[PDB]
Amino acid sequence: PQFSLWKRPVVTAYIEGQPVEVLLDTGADDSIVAGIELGNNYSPKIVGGIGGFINTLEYKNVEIEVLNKKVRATIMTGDTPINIFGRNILTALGMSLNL
Amino acid sequence: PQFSLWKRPVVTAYIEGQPVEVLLDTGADDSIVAGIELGNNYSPKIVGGIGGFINTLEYKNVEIEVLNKKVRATIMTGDTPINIFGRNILTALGMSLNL
């Protein structure tokens, strides 16, 4: 598909079967998701953006289906105002920015 | 041109004759640059991020040259770790995210 950017590039994904609305984000190195519990095999992390820093919990090899594709990808959970799939996932979908 | 996203999508833009490196950012509504001075025709803005909010100064109709094109866009100035071109600049340019 094509996202033309007049509006935000927002889709629904399934993360281990749970439906989440996520923002496709070329400006995020990582993917961060608020309000889902991925269990106990995590490593605590710090990520920055505009406005400071967050403590996240890093989960490896999590199962996602989005845009009718299926990937296993690293997901961080933390207190974010918007769930973002960053370049770790965009690349695995084979997505590019074109002009 | 095509951006693969294996590395952050970072280009040199000129904003009123001045060279800067900017991340092309699909998850940013607006465009924020640190270390420009654009003057006194400004309106103060609040812009939400992942970490918190920043106060910025917004300027309308700024002349920008990037990727061998020239555009007039709204640019906000402030304390951002990295310089962002958001969707207001990507759609002016005609860029899309493709799958």
Side-chain angles (χ1 to χ4, degrees), chain A residues 1-3 5-6 8 24 26 87 96-99, chain B residues 1-3 5 24-26 29 51 87 96-99:
Chain A
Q2 165 165 111
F3 302 88
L5 306 170
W6 286 110
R8 315 183 167 176
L24 312 175
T26 65
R87 291 193 293 106
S96 64
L97 257 172
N98 287 268
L99 186 44
Chain B
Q2 179 182 84
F3 301 89
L5 306 169
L24 306 177
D25 189 341
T26 60
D29 280 341
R87 301 192 282 103
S96 67
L97 194 46
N98 300 77
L99 175 52

mmCIF file with all atom_site columns, all heavy atoms in Angstrom, chain A residues 1-3 5-6 8 24 26 87 96-99, chain B residues 1-3 5 24-26 29 51 87 96-99:
data_model
loop_
_atom_site.group_PDB
_atom_site.id
_atom_site.type_symbol
_atom_site.label_atom_id
_atom_site.label_alt_id
_atom_site.label_comp_id
_atom_site.label_asym_id
_atom_site.label_entity_id
_atom_site.label_seq_id
_atom_site.pdbx_PDB_ins_code
_atom_site.Cartn_x
_atom_site.Cartn_y
_atom_site.Cartn_z
_atom_site.occupancy
_atom_site.B_iso_or_equiv
_atom_site.pdbx_formal_charge
_atom_site.auth_seq_id
_atom_site.auth_comp_id
_atom_site.auth_asym_id
_atom_site.auth_atom_id
_atom_site.pdbx_PDB_model_num
ATOM 1   N N   . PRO A 1 1  ? 0.806  -1.267 0.000  1.00 0.00 ? 1  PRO A N   1
ATOM 2   C CA  . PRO A 1 1  ? 0.000  0.000  0.000  1.00 0.00 ? 1  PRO A CA  1
ATOM 3   C C   . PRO A 1 1  ? 0.828  1.302  0.000  1.00 0.00 ? 1  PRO A C   1
ATOM 4   O O   . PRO A 1 1  ? 2.051  1.374  0.040  1.00 0.00 ? 1  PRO A O   1
ATOM 5   C CB  . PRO A 1 1  ? -0.904 -0.040 1.236  1.00 0.00 ? 1  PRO A CB  1
ATOM 6   C CG  . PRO A 1 1  ? -0.301 -1.129 2.115  1.00 0.00 ? 1  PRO A CG  1
ATOM 7   C CD  . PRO A 1 1  ? 0.315  -2.102 1.126  1.00 0.00 ? 1  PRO A CD  1
ATOM 8   N N   . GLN A 1 2  ? 0.145  2.378  -0.011 1.00 0.00 ? 2  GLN A N   1
ATOM 9   C CA  . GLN A 1 2  ? 0.857  3.627  0.035  1.00 0.00 ? 2  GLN A CA  1
ATOM 10  C C   . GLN A 1 2  ? 0.253  4.511  1.121  1.00 0.00 ? 2  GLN A C   1
ATOM 11  O O   . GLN A 1 2  ? -0.954 4.561  1.307  1.00 0.00 ? 2  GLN A O   1
ATOM 12  C CB  . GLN A 1 2  ? 0.809  4.250  -1.311 1.00 0.00 ? 2  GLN A CB  1
ATOM 13  C CG  . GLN A 1 2  ? 1.235  5.690  -1.144 1.00 0.00 ? 2  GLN A CG  1
ATOM 14  C CD  . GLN A 1 2  ? 1.560  6.312  -2.485 1.00 0.00 ? 2  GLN A CD  1
ATOM 15  O OE1 . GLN A 1 2  ? 0.838  7.200  -2.988 1.00 0.00 ? 2  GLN A OE1 1
ATOM 16  N NE2 . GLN A 1 2  ? 2.652  5.806  -3.025 1.00 0.00 ? 2  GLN A NE2 1
ATOM 17  N N   . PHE A 1 3  ? 1.069  5.122  1.907  1.00 0.00 ? 3  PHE A N   1
ATOM 18  C CA  . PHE A 1 3  ? 0.617  6.125  2.867  1.00 0.00 ? 3  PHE A CA  1
ATOM 19  C C   . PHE A 1 3  ? 1.185  7.513  2.366  1.00 0.00 ? 3  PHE A C   1
ATOM 20  O O   . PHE A 1 3  ? 2.406  7.662  2.195  1.00 0.00 ? 3  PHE A O   1
ATOM 21  C CB  . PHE A 1 3  ? 1.201  5.783  4.268  1.00 0.00 ? 3  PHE A CB  1
ATOM 22  C CG  . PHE A 1 3  ? 0.839  4.380  4.821  1.00 0.00 ? 3  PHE A CG  1
ATOM 23  C CD1 . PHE A 1 3  ? 1.631  3.280  4.519  1.00 0.00 ? 3  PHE A CD1 1
ATOM 24  C CD2 . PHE A 1 3  ? -0.296 4.218  5.637  1.00 0.00 ? 3  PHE A CD2 1
ATOM 25  C CE1 . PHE A 1 3  ? 1.217  2.006  4.939  1.00 0.00 ? 3  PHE A CE1 1
ATOM 26  C CE2 . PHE A 1 3  ? -0.691 2.943  6.067  1.00 0.00 ? 3  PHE A CE2 1
ATOM 27  C CZ  . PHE A 1 3  ? 0.068  1.829  5.698  1.00 0.00 ? 3  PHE A CZ  1
ATOM 28  N N   . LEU A 1 5  ? 0.496  10.606 3.775  1.00 0.00 ? 5  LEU A N   1
ATOM 29  C CA  . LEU A 1 5  ? 0.942  11.506 4.864  1.00 0.00 ? 5  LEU A CA  1
ATOM 30  C C   . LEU A 1 5  ? 0.073  12.750 5.103  1.00 0.00 ? 5  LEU A C   1
ATOM 31  O O   . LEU A 1 5  ? 0.395  13.488 5.984  1.00 0.00 ? 5  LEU A O   1
ATOM 32  C CB  . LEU A 1 5  ? 2.381  11.875 4.724  1.00 0.00 ? 5  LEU A CB  1
ATOM 33  C CG  . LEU A 1 5  ? 3.298  10.672 4.614  1.00 0.00 ? 5  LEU A CG  1
ATOM 34  C CD1 . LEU A 1 5  ? 4.672  11.126 4.239  1.00 0.00 ? 5  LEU A CD1 1
ATOM 35  C CD2 . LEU A 1 5  ? 3.243  9.699  5.856  1.00 0.00 ? 5  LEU A CD2 1
ATOM 36  N N   . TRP A 1 6  ? -0.997 12.983 4.370  1.00 0.00 ? 6  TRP A N   1
ATOM 37  C CA  . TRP A 1 6  ? -1.903 14.139 4.617  1.00 0.00 ? 6  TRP A CA  1
ATOM 38  C C   . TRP A 1 6  ? -2.524 14.038 5.966  1.00 0.00 ? 6  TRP A C   1
ATOM 39  O O   . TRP A 1 6  ? -2.636 15.018 6.785  1.00 0.00 ? 6  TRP A O   1
ATOM 40  C CB  . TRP A 1 6  ? -2.952 14.127 3.552  1.00 0.00 ? 6  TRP A CB  1
ATOM 41  C CG  . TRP A 1 6  ? -2.324 14.597 2.221  1.00 0.00 ? 6  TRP A CG  1
ATOM 42  C CD1 . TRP A 1 6  ? -2.074 13.871 1.124  1.00 0.00 ? 6  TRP A CD1 1
ATOM 43  C CD2 . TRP A 1 6  ? -1.807 15.933 1.988  1.00 0.00 ? 6  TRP A CD2 1
ATOM 44  N NE1 . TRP A 1 6  ? -1.246 14.671 0.257  1.00 0.00 ? 6  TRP A NE1 1
ATOM 45  C CE2 . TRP A 1 6  ? -1.205 15.904 0.726  1.00 0.00 ? 6  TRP A CE2 1
ATOM 46  C CE3 . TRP A 1 6  ? -1.785 17.137 2.738  1.00 0.00 ? 6  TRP A CE3 1
ATOM 47  C CZ2 . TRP A 1 6  ? -0.661 17.058 0.110  1.00 0.00 ? 6  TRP A CZ2 1
ATOM 48  C CZ3 . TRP A 1 6  ? -1.241 18.269 2.102  1.00 0.00 ? 6  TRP A CZ3 1
ATOM 49  C CH2 . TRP A 1 6  ? -0.721 18.242 0.836  1.00 0.00 ? 6  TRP A CH2 1
ATOM 50  N N   . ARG A 1 8  ? -2.159 11.295 9.547  1.00 0.00 ? 8  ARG A N   1
ATOM 51  C CA  . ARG A 1 8  ? -1.183 10.368 10.231 1.00 0.00 ? 8  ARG A CA  1
ATOM 52  C C   . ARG A 1 8  ? -1.264 8.953  9.663  1.00 0.00 ? 8  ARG A C   1
ATOM 53  O O   . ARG A 1 8  ? -2.379 8.419  9.490  1.00 0.00 ? 8  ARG A O   1
ATOM 54  C CB  . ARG A 1 8  ? -1.270 10.169 11.739 1.00 0.00 ? 8  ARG A CB  1
ATOM 55  C CG  . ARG A 1 8  ? -1.442 11.439 12.527 1.00 0.00 ? 8  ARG A CG  1
ATOM 56  C CD  . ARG A 1 8  ? -1.464 11.264 14.048 1.00 0.00 ? 8  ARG A CD  1
ATOM 57  N NE  . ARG A 1 8  ? -1.320 12.617 14.656 1.00 0.00 ? 8  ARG A NE  1
ATOM 58  C CZ  . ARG A 1 8  ? -1.378 12.898 15.969 1.00 0.00 ? 8  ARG A CZ  1
ATOM 59  N NH1 . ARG A 1 8  ? -1.625 11.918 16.838 1.00 0.00 ? 8  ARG A NH1 1
ATOM 60  N NH2 . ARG A 1 8  ? -1.203 14.148 16.415 1.00 0.00 ? 8  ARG A NH2 1
ATOM 61  N N   . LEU A 1 24 ? 2.933  4.479  12.251 1.00 0.00 ? 24 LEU A N   1
ATOM 62  C CA  . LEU A 1 24 ? 4.172  4.086  11.536 1.00 0.00 ? 24 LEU A CA  1
ATOM 63  C C   . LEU A 1 24 ? 5.207  5.264  11.568 1.00 0.00 ? 24 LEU A C   1
ATOM 64  O O   . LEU A 1 24 ? 4.936  6.307  10.905 1.00 0.00 ? 24 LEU A O   1
ATOM 65  C CB  . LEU A 1 24 ? 3.888  3.608  10.124 1.00 0.00 ? 24 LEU A CB  1
ATOM 66  C CG  . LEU A 1 24 ? 2.749  2.601  10.148 1.00 0.00 ? 24 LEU A CG  1
ATOM 67  C CD1 . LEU A 1 24 ? 2.405  2.239  8.744  1.00 0.00 ? 24 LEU A CD1 1
ATOM 68  C CD2 . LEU A 1 24 ? 3.262  1.294  10.795 1.00 0.00 ? 24 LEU A CD2 1
ATOM 69  N N   . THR A 1 26 ? 9.119  6.761  10.972 1.00 0.00 ? 26 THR A N   1
ATOM 70  C CA  . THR A 1 26 ? 10.499 6.692  10.389 1.00 0.00 ? 26 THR A CA  1
ATOM 71  C C   . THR A 1 26 ? 11.483 7.388  11.251 1.00 0.00 ? 26 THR A C   1
ATOM 72  O O   . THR A 1 26 ? 12.631 6.990  11.277 1.00 0.00 ? 26 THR A O   1
ATOM 73  C CB  . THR A 1 26 ? 10.475 7.147  8.967  1.00 0.00 ? 26 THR A CB  1
ATOM 74  O OG1 . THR A 1 26 ? 10.123 8.551  8.927  1.00 0.00 ? 26 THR A OG1 1
ATOM 75  C CG2 . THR A 1 26 ? 9.517  6.245  8.049  1.00 0.00 ? 26 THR A CG2 1
ATOM 76  N N   . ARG A 1 87 ? 11.672 1.921  13.134 1.00 0.00 ? 87 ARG A N   1
ATOM 77  C CA  . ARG A 1 87 ? 12.395 1.418  11.947 1.00 0.00 ? 87 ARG A CA  1
ATOM 78  C C   . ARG A 1 87 ? 12.729 -0.127 12.056 1.00 0.00 ? 87 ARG A C   1
ATOM 79  O O   . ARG A 1 87 ? 12.852 -0.783 11.021 1.00 0.00 ? 87 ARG A O   1
ATOM 80  C CB  . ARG A 1 87 ? 13.685 2.268  11.745 1.00 0.00 ? 87 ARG A CB  1
ATOM 81  C CG  . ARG A 1 87 ? 13.477 3.777  11.290 1.00 0.00 ? 87 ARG A CG  1
ATOM 82  C CD  . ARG A 1 87 ? 14.855 4.304  10.843 1.00 0.00 ? 87 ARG A CD  1
ATOM 83  N NE  . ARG A 1 87 ? 15.728 4.384  11.988 1.00 0.00 ? 87 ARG A NE  1
ATOM 84  C CZ  . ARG A 1 87 ? 16.787 3.544  12.290 1.00 0.00 ? 87 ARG A CZ  1
ATOM 85  N NH1 . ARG A 1 87 ? 17.116 2.519  11.471 1.00 0.00 ? 87 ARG A NH1 1
ATOM 86  N NH2 . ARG A 1 87 ? 17.497 3.756  13.444 1.00 0.00 ? 87 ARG A NH2 1
ATOM 87  N N   . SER A 1 96 ? 9.728  1.501  2.758  1.00 0.00 ? 96 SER A N   1
ATOM 88  C CA  . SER A 1 96 ? 10.686 2.614  2.367  1.00 0.00 ? 96 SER A CA  1
ATOM 89  C C   . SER A 1 96 ? 9.930  3.990  2.247  1.00 0.00 ? 96 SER A C   1
ATOM 90  O O   . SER A 1 96 ? 8.707  4.036  1.967  1.00 0.00 ? 96 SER A O   1
ATOM 91  C CB  . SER A 1 96 ? 11.313 2.250  0.954  1.00 0.00 ? 96 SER A CB  1
ATOM 92  O OG  . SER A 1 96 ? 10.291 2.219  -0.061 1.00 0.00 ? 96 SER A OG  1
ATOM 93  N N   . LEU A 1 97 ? 10.662 5.067  2.417  1.00 0.00 ? 97 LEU A N   1
ATOM 94  C CA  . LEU A 1 97 ? 10.160 6.459  2.064  1.00 0.00 ? 97 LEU A CA  1
ATOM 95  C C   . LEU A 1 97 ? 10.674 6.778  0.686  1.00 0.00 ? 97 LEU A C   1
ATOM 96  O O   . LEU A 1 97 ? 11.894 6.764  0.426  1.00 0.00 ? 97 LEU A O   1
ATOM 97  C CB  . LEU A 1 97 ? 10.938 7.463  2.866  1.00 0.00 ? 97 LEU A CB  1
ATOM 98  C CG  . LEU A 1 97 ? 10.279 8.116  4.115  1.00 0.00 ? 97 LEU A CG  1
ATOM 99  C CD1 . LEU A 1 97 ? 11.310 8.985  4.921  1.00 0.00 ? 97 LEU A CD1 1
ATOM 100 C CD2 . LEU A 1 97 ? 8.860  8.776  3.922  1.00 0.00 ? 97 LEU A CD2 1
ATOM 101 N N   . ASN A 1 98 ? 9.765  7.148  -0.142 1.00 0.00 ? 98 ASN A N   1
ATOM 102 C CA  . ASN A 1 98 ? 10.021 7.466  -1.548 1.00 0.00 ? 98 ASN A CA  1
ATOM 103 C C   . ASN A 1 98 ? 9.531  8.881  -1.933 1.00 0.00 ? 98 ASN A C   1
ATOM 104 O O   . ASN A 1 98 ? 8.480  9.291  -1.457 1.00 0.00 ? 98 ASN A O   1
ATOM 105 C CB  . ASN A 1 98 ? 9.231  6.505  -2.364 1.00 0.00 ? 98 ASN A CB  1
ATOM 106 C CG  . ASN A 1 98 ? 9.863  5.137  -2.314 1.00 0.00 ? 98 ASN A CG  1
ATOM 107 O OD1 . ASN A 1 98 ? 10.689 4.779  -3.159 1.00 0.00 ? 98 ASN A OD1 1
ATOM 108 N ND2 . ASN A 1 98 ? 9.480  4.414  -1.275 1.00 0.00 ? 98 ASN A ND2 1
ATOM 109 N N   . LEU A 1 99 ? 10.245 9.485  -2.863 1.00 0.00 ? 99 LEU A N   1
ATOM 110 C CA  . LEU A 1 99 ? 10.030 10.764 -3.560 1.00 0.00 ? 99 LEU A CA  1
ATOM 111 C C   . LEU A 1 99 ? 10.249 10.436 -5.037 1.00 0.00 ? 99 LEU A C   1
ATOM 112 O O   . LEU A 1 99 ? 11.316 9.903  -5.404 1.00 0.00 ? 99 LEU A O   1
ATOM 113 C CB  . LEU A 1 99 ? 11.098 11.910 -3.075 1.00 0.00 ? 99 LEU A CB  1
ATOM 114 C CG  . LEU A 1 99 ? 10.904 13.405 -3.622 1.00 0.00 ? 99 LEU A CG  1
ATOM 115 C CD1 . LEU A 1 99 ? 9.506  13.886 -3.610 1.00 0.00 ? 99 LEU A CD1 1
ATOM 116 C CD2 . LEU A 1 99 ? 11.712 14.510 -2.951 1.00 0.00 ? 99 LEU A CD2 1
ATOM 117 N N   . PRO B 1 1  ? 14.023 9.783  -5.389 1.00 0.00 ? 1  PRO B N   1
ATOM 118 C CA  . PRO B 1 1  ? 14.932 9.050  -4.435 1.00 0.00 ? 1  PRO B CA  1
ATOM 119 C C   . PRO B 1 1  ? 14.176 8.108  -3.403 1.00 0.00 ? 1  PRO B C   1
ATOM 120 O O   . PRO B 1 1  ? 12.949 8.182  -3.188 1.00 0.00 ? 1  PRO B O   1
ATOM 121 C CB  . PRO B 1 1  ? 15.827 10.099 -3.769 1.00 0.00 ? 1  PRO B CB  1
ATOM 122 C CG  . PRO B 1 1  ? 15.248 11.433 -4.158 1.00 0.00 ? 1  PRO B CG  1
ATOM 123 C CD  . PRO B 1 1  ? 14.513 11.176 -5.474 1.00 0.00 ? 1  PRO B CD  1
ATOM 124 N N   . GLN B 1 2  ? 14.898 7.113  -2.898 1.00 0.00 ? 2  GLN B N   1
ATOM 125 C CA  . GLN B 1 2  ? 14.289 6.141  -1.981 1.00 0.00 ? 2  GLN B CA  1
ATOM 126 C C   . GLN B 1 2  ? 15.143 5.909  -0.708 1.00 0.00 ? 2  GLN B C   1
ATOM 127 O O   . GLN B 1 2  ? 16.380 5.888  -0.790 1.00 0.00 ? 2  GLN B O   1
ATOM 128 C CB  . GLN B 1 2  ? 14.000 4.918  -2.758 1.00 0.00 ? 2  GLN B CB  1
ATOM 129 C CG  . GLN B 1 2  ? 13.402 3.856  -1.897 1.00 0.00 ? 2  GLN B CG  1
ATOM 130 C CD  . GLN B 1 2  ? 13.198 2.647  -2.785 1.00 0.00 ? 2  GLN B CD  1
ATOM 131 O OE1 . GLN B 1 2  ? 14.155 1.872  -2.969 1.00 0.00 ? 2  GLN B OE1 1
ATOM 132 N NE2 . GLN B 1 2  ? 12.075 2.638  -3.475 1.00 0.00 ? 2  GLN B NE2 1
ATOM 133 N N   . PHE B 1 3  ? 14.473 6.055  0.433  1.00 0.00 ? 3  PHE B N   1
ATOM 134 C CA  . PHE B 1 3  ? 15.064 5.813  1.782  1.00 0.00 ? 3  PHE B CA  1
ATOM 135 C C   . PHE B 1 3  ? 14.731 4.378  2.331  1.00 0.00 ? 3  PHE B C   1
ATOM 136 O O   . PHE B 1 3  ? 13.567 4.119  2.619  1.00 0.00 ? 3  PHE B O   1
ATOM 137 C CB  . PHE B 1 3  ? 14.624 6.905  2.804  1.00 0.00 ? 3  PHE B CB  1
ATOM 138 C CG  . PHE B 1 3  ? 15.067 8.275  2.270  1.00 0.00 ? 3  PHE B CG  1
ATOM 139 C CD1 . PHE B 1 3  ? 14.222 8.994  1.442  1.00 0.00 ? 3  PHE B CD1 1
ATOM 140 C CD2 . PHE B 1 3  ? 16.323 8.798  2.616  1.00 0.00 ? 3  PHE B CD2 1
ATOM 141 C CE1 . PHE B 1 3  ? 14.728 10.061 0.732  1.00 0.00 ? 3  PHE B CE1 1
ATOM 142 C CE2 . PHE B 1 3  ? 16.801 9.938  1.980  1.00 0.00 ? 3  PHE B CE2 1
ATOM 143 C CZ  . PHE B 1 3  ? 16.003 10.543 1.017  1.00 0.00 ? 3  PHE B CZ  1
ATOM 144 N N   . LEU B 1 5  ? 15.722 2.856  5.400  1.00 0.00 ? 5  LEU B N   1
ATOM 145 C CA  . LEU B 1 5  ? 15.395 2.834  6.833  1.00 0.00 ? 5  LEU B CA  1
ATOM 146 C C   . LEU B 1 5  ? 16.265 1.845  7.631  1.00 0.00 ? 5  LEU B C   1
ATOM 147 O O   . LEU B 1 5  ? 16.098 1.741  8.829  1.00 0.00 ? 5  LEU B O   1
ATOM 148 C CB  . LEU B 1 5  ? 13.905 2.601  7.081  1.00 0.00 ? 5  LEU B CB  1
ATOM 149 C CG  . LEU B 1 5  ? 13.001 3.644  6.312  1.00 0.00 ? 5  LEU B CG  1
ATOM 150 C CD1 . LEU B 1 5  ? 11.511 3.142  6.400  1.00 0.00 ? 5  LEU B CD1 1
ATOM 151 C CD2 . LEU B 1 5  ? 13.279 5.110  6.867  1.00 0.00 ? 5  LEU B CD2 1
ATOM 152 N N   . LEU B 1 24 ? 13.933 12.877 8.523  1.00 0.00 ? 24 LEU B N   1
ATOM 153 C CA  . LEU B 1 24 ? 12.583 12.808 7.881  1.00 0.00 ? 24 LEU B CA  1
ATOM 154 C C   . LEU B 1 24 ? 11.645 11.860 8.706  1.00 0.00 ? 24 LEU B C   1
ATOM 155 O O   . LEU B 1 24 ? 11.978 10.661 8.900  1.00 0.00 ? 24 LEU B O   1
ATOM 156 C CB  . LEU B 1 24 ? 12.756 12.249 6.470  1.00 0.00 ? 24 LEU B CB  1
ATOM 157 C CG  . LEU B 1 24 ? 13.789 13.052 5.667  1.00 0.00 ? 24 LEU B CG  1
ATOM 158 C CD1 . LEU B 1 24 ? 13.927 12.351 4.320  1.00 0.00 ? 24 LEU B CD1 1
ATOM 159 C CD2 . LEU B 1 24 ? 13.313 14.500 5.477  1.00 0.00 ? 24 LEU B CD2 1
ATOM 160 N N   . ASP B 1 25 ? 10.631 12.472 9.283  1.00 0.00 ? 25 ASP B N   1
ATOM 161 C CA  . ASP B 1 25 ? 9.925  11.938 10.493 1.00 0.00 ? 25 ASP B CA  1
ATOM 162 C C   . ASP B 1 25 ? 8.423  11.773 10.216 1.00 0.00 ? 25 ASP B C   1
ATOM 163 O O   . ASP B 1 25 ? 7.647  12.698 10.336 1.00 0.00 ? 25 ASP B O   1
ATOM 164 C CB  . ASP B 1 25 ? 10.199 12.760 11.762 1.00 0.00 ? 25 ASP B CB  1
ATOM 165 C CG  . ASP B 1 25 ? 9.666  12.098 12.973 1.00 0.00 ? 25 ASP B CG  1
ATOM 166 O OD1 . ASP B 1 25 ? 8.806  11.242 12.852 1.00 0.00 ? 25 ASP B OD1 1
ATOM 167 O OD2 . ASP B 1 25 ? 10.087 12.396 14.100 1.00 0.00 ? 25 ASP B OD2 1
ATOM 168 N N   . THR B 1 26 ? 7.973  10.608 9.795  1.00 0.00 ? 26 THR B N   1
ATOM 169 C CA  . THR B 1 26 ? 6.467  10.372 9.494  1.00 0.00 ? 26 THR B CA  1
ATOM 170 C C   . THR B 1 26 ? 5.574  10.339 10.739 1.00 0.00 ? 26 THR B C   1
ATOM 171 O O   . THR B 1 26 ? 4.345  10.357 10.597 1.00 0.00 ? 26 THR B O   1
ATOM 172 C CB  . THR B 1 26 ? 6.130  9.030  8.727  1.00 0.00 ? 26 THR B CB  1
ATOM 173 O OG1 . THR B 1 26 ? 6.578  7.977  9.536  1.00 0.00 ? 26 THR B OG1 1
ATOM 174 C CG2 . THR B 1 26 ? 6.723  8.929  7.284  1.00 0.00 ? 26 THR B CG2 1
ATOM 175 N N   . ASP B 1 29 ? 3.757  15.430 13.464 1.00 0.00 ? 29 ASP B N   1
ATOM 176 C CA  . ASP B 1 29 ? 2.869  16.291 12.770 1.00 0.00 ? 29 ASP B CA  1
ATOM 177 C C   . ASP B 1 29 ? 3.606  17.507 12.154 1.00 0.00 ? 29 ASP B C   1
ATOM 178 O O   . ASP B 1 29 ? 3.178  18.039 11.133 1.00 0.00 ? 29 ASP B O   1
ATOM 179 C CB  . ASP B 1 29 ? 1.948  16.847 13.785 1.00 0.00 ? 29 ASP B CB  1
ATOM 180 C CG  . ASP B 1 29 ? 0.827  15.940 14.184 1.00 0.00 ? 29 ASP B CG  1
ATOM 181 O OD1 . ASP B 1 29 ? 0.475  14.977 13.465 1.00 0.00 ? 29 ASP B OD1 1
ATOM 182 O OD2 . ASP B 1 29 ? 0.264  16.219 15.270 1.00 0.00 ? 29 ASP B OD2 1
ATOM 183 N N   . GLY B 1 51 ? 8.461  12.078 25.673 1.00 0.00 ? 51 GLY B N   1
ATOM 184 C CA  . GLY B 1 51 ? 8.942  12.355 27.039 1.00 0.00 ? 51 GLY B CA  1
ATOM 185 C C   . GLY B 1 51 ? 8.207  13.394 27.867 1.00 0.00 ? 51 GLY B C   1
ATOM 186 O O   . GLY B 1 51 ? 8.468  13.562 29.068 1.00 0.00 ? 51 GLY B O   1
ATOM 187 N N   . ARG B 1 87 ? 5.400  15.712 8.973  1.00 0.00 ? 87 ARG B N   1
ATOM 188 C CA  . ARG B 1 87 ? 4.460  15.516 7.818  1.00 0.00 ? 87 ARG B CA  1
ATOM 189 C C   . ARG B 1 87 ? 4.159  16.850 7.094  1.00 0.00 ? 87 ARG B C   1
ATOM 190 O O   . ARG B 1 87 ? 3.819  16.767 5.930  1.00 0.00 ? 87 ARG B O   1
ATOM 191 C CB  . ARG B 1 87 ? 3.099  14.810 8.186  1.00 0.00 ? 87 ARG B CB  1
ATOM 192 C CG  . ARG B 1 87 ? 3.334  13.351 8.825  1.00 0.00 ? 87 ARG B CG  1
ATOM 193 C CD  . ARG B 1 87 ? 1.953  12.648 8.854  1.00 0.00 ? 87 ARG B CD  1
ATOM 194 N NE  . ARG B 1 87 ? 1.204  13.190 9.990  1.00 0.00 ? 87 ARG B NE  1
ATOM 195 C CZ  . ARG B 1 87 ? 0.177  14.130 9.829  1.00 0.00 ? 87 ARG B CZ  1
ATOM 196 N NH1 . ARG B 1 87 ? -0.313 14.449 8.607  1.00 0.00 ? 87 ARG B NH1 1
ATOM 197 N NH2 . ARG B 1 87 ? -0.340 14.842 10.864 1.00 0.00 ? 87 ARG B NH2 1
ATOM 198 N N   . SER B 1 96 ? 6.145  9.796  0.194  1.00 0.00 ? 96 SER B N   1
ATOM 199 C CA  . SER B 1 96 ? 5.185  8.817  0.672  1.00 0.00 ? 96 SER B CA  1
ATOM 200 C C   . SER B 1 96 ? 5.981  7.754  1.287  1.00 0.00 ? 96 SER B C   1
ATOM 201 O O   . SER B 1 96 ? 7.192  7.718  1.078  1.00 0.00 ? 96 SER B O   1
ATOM 202 C CB  . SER B 1 96 ? 4.206  8.315  -0.380 1.00 0.00 ? 96 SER B CB  1
ATOM 203 O OG  . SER B 1 96 ? 4.962  7.585  -1.316 1.00 0.00 ? 96 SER B OG  1
ATOM 204 N N   . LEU B 1 97 ? 5.365  7.083  2.230  1.00 0.00 ? 97 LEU B N   1
ATOM 205 C CA  . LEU B 1 97 ? 5.870  5.748  2.822  1.00 0.00 ? 97 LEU B CA  1
ATOM 206 C C   . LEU B 1 97 ? 5.202  4.605  2.051  1.00 0.00 ? 97 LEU B C   1
ATOM 207 O O   . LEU B 1 97 ? 4.026  4.745  1.764  1.00 0.00 ? 97 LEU B O   1
ATOM 208 C CB  . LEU B 1 97 ? 5.197  5.767  4.201  1.00 0.00 ? 97 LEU B CB  1
ATOM 209 C CG  . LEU B 1 97 ? 5.740  4.780  5.166  1.00 0.00 ? 97 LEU B CG  1
ATOM 210 C CD1 . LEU B 1 97 ? 7.296  4.769  5.171  1.00 0.00 ? 97 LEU B CD1 1
ATOM 211 C CD2 . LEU B 1 97 ? 5.148  5.122  6.590  1.00 0.00 ? 97 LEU B CD2 1
ATOM 212 N N   . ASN B 1 98 ? 5.941  3.715  1.455  1.00 0.00 ? 98 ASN B N   1
ATOM 213 C CA  . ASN B 1 98 ? 5.433  2.621  0.599  1.00 0.00 ? 98 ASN B CA  1
ATOM 214 C C   . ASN B 1 98 ? 5.802  1.215  1.168  1.00 0.00 ? 98 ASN B C   1
ATOM 215 O O   . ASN B 1 98 ? 6.705  1.022  1.983  1.00 0.00 ? 98 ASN B O   1
ATOM 216 C CB  . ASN B 1 98 ? 5.930  2.663  -0.867 1.00 0.00 ? 98 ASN B CB  1
ATOM 217 C CG  . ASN B 1 98 ? 5.439  4.014  -1.477 1.00 0.00 ? 98 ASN B CG  1
ATOM 218 O OD1 . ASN B 1 98 ? 6.035  5.018  -1.173 1.00 0.00 ? 98 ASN B OD1 1
ATOM 219 N ND2 . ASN B 1 98 ? 4.232  4.080  -2.012 1.00 0.00 ? 98 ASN B ND2 1
ATOM 220 N N   . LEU B 1 99 ? 4.886  0.356  0.852  1.00 0.00 ? 99 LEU B N   1
ATOM 221 C CA  . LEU B 1 99 ? 4.872  -1.094 1.179  1.00 0.00 ? 99 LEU B CA  1
ATOM 222 C C   . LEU B 1 99 ? 4.662  -1.899 -0.136 1.00 0.00 ? 99 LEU B C   1
ATOM 223 O O   . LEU B 1 99 ? 3.611  -1.770 -0.797 1.00 0.00 ? 99 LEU B O   1
ATOM 224 C CB  . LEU B 1 99 ? 3.760  -1.375 2.221  1.00 0.00 ? 99 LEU B CB  1
ATOM 225 C CG  . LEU B 1 99 ? 3.552  -2.855 2.547  1.00 0.00 ? 99 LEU B CG  1
ATOM 226 C CD1 . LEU B 1 99 ? 4.821  -3.582 2.945  1.00 0.00 ? 99 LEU B CD1 1
ATOM 227 C CD2 . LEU B 1 99 ? 2.489  -2.991 3.615  1.00 0.00 ? 99 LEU B CD2 1
#
